[PDB]
Amino acid sequence: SGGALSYDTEILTTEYGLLPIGDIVESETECTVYSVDSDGSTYTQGVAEWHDRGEQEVFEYCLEDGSTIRATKDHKFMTTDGEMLPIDEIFESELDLMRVDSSGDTKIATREYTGSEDVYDIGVESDHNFALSDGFIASN
């Protein structure tokens, strides 16, 4: 099933620190975003995949830091073990998220629903994972 990120979601990038996921799909750029290698090393990828899933009922995942992730449970993220799992399972099994070139929580504190809005998703053909600002390392 089609998992996607909210249009308000923001990428972790070399061009500005911050860019909205909306700009990547609706203005078709290839700006370098953070990702992981097969050897579990942090690197960058210019975007090669962009898609619009329309309108979906979005979920809010709160961190201990008070920050919030906004996505669907339908797409699989990955832990520090290199094991691929949905954000919803990483929450209720309390699993550690993968490290990145920014300070962030590994465990999610809370889960809530928030209403339907514009949703988007992005990737690359090799490693197919992306780092978000106030968000988990997305994968599909």
Give how far Cα 2 sits from Cα of 40, 100, 135, Å: 26, 25, 19
CATH-assigned architecture of domain 5-139: Beta Complex (2.170)
Distance between CA atoms of residues 126 and 73, nearest Å: 23
Phi, psi of 92 (to 5 degrees): -85, -15
Q: Domain-by-domain residue ranges, the chain?
A: 5-139
1 secondary structure, DSSP code: -
CB atoms within 10 A of CB 139: 21
With beta carbons less than 8 A apart as the criterion, state whether 21 and 89 touch: no
What single-letter amino acid sits at 111?
R
User: What is the b/e burial string over 68-85, where b = at least 16 CB atoms within 10 angstroms of the residue's CB?
Assistant: bbbbbeebbbbbeeeeeb
With beta carbons less than 8 A apart as the criterion, state whether 77 and 135 touch: no
Q: How was this structure determined?
A: NMR
Distance between CA atoms of residues 131 and 102, nearest Å: 10
Q: Which two tokens stand for residue 43?
A: 């690197």
CA gyration radius for the chain? 14
